[PDB]
Structures are given as structure tokens and as C-alpha cells.
């Protein structure tokens, strides 16, 4: 509010950019034409295993249809992502991740990545008790035009997204 918030006027996830887990700046317009799941991850949560395994399942099954997964580590929830980006990359490799890992970010507060600020105010990005990210492994499903079409909370295992994603290919 006192901060610059021209991010509010973006019309698509595809307008944004973010550093990948190796520190390289990626323009998210590469996802034009691809159904995407954007999620915040952490390594030291009780549901880390179920989330990583099922995200890998989704990518393995649907990458050929155009499914992409953008995983943003964050240490904002119980300090459950204390590692460096290199350590997080290695952790993801242990789950045979082949989707897109990003550098660690904040997802809540004034210093959150602006993509996350933007997703949280979208009509289909609404949370329950306000729009803040509540814990690790929130998921946003994004259509081929970069519009948010659904939000899933931490406790919704990634395979629940499988019911919805085929409508957007």
C-alpha cells in the first residue's frame, strides 16, 4: 500500500520474471500455451514427501500435454526451508524432480515476490481466512493464458489438482 504496487495491474502470470534455483533470470512468458501449477515448497514439513512425490507424478503424467510446474522454495513457514538454493536443488533431485525449481523467495509480506503478491489477489486465487499463503505447499492452477483458475491449500494433496487440470489443455 505505501509500497509500489503496480504488480496489481499485471494481467497474466506470463508477465513476471523470477530467478531459477541456479540464480538465472527466467521470464515466465515461456509458459504461454502451457497449463501451469505454481507452488511454494519446503523440505522439512511432514507433508514434504507426499507433495513432492505427487507433483513429480503430475509432471511425469502430463508434461507431454503441456503441464509445467513452477516450485518456489520459501522459509517463511516454520523455518522448514533453511537450506541454500544448491541444497534445495539436491533435495528435489532426490525425488526425481524434472519440473522447474526456482530460487528461494518470500511469498507473504511486503517483501514477497510480486508474482505471489499478484496470484493472491486474483479472483480465483482467494484464500479462506484472507489471501495470505498459510503454509508450505499452497498450489495455484494457471491456464494457458496465465490466468489463475483455482487455488488449493497446503493440505490438499497435489493429486486433487488432477481432476481440474485436464479442462485447461
Amino acid at each position: 500500500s505505501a509500497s509500489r504496487d503496480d504488480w496489481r495491474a499485471a494481467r497474466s502470470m506470463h508477465e513476471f520474471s523470477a530467478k531459477d534455483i541456479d540464480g538465472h533470470m527466467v521470464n515466465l512468458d515461456k509458459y504461454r500455451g502451457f497449463v501451469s501449477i505454481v507452488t511454494n515448497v519446503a523440505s522439512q514439513c511432514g507433508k514434504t514427501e507426499v507433495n513432492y512425490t505427487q507433483l513429480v507424478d503430475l509432471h511425469a503424467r502430463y508434461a507431454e500435454r503441456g503441464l509445467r510446474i513452477l516450485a518456489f522454495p520459501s522459509n517463511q513457514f516454520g523455518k522448514q526451508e533453511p537450506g541454500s538454493n544448491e541444497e534445495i536443488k539436491e533435495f528435489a533431485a532426490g525425488y526425481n524432480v524434472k519440473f522447474d525449481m526456482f530460487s528461494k523467495i518470500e511469498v507473504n509480506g511486503d517483501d514477497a515476490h510480486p508474482l505471489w503478491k499478484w496470484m493472491k489477489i486474483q479472483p480465483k486465487g482467494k484464500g479462506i481466512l484472507g489471501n495470505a499463503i498459510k503454509w508450505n505447499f499452497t498450489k495455484f492452477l494457471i491456464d494457458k493464458n496465465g490466468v489463475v483458475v483455482k487455488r488449493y491449500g497446503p493440505m490438499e494433496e497435489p493429486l486433487v489438482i488432477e481432476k481440474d487440470l485436464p479442462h485447461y489443455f
Binding site: 513476471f16 520474471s17 523470477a18 521470464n27
Partner: peptide, 13 residues
């Protein structure tokens, strides 16, 4: 740039 994050432009014109 419409939104900076750390040392890069997170939302280009």
C-alpha cells in the same frame, strides 16, 4: 520495470 525483487526486474514493461 514495474516491480523489482531483490536485484532484478520481476515485472518488465
Amino acid at each position: 520495470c514495474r516491480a523489482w525483487y531483490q536485484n532484478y526486474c520481476a515485472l518488465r514493461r
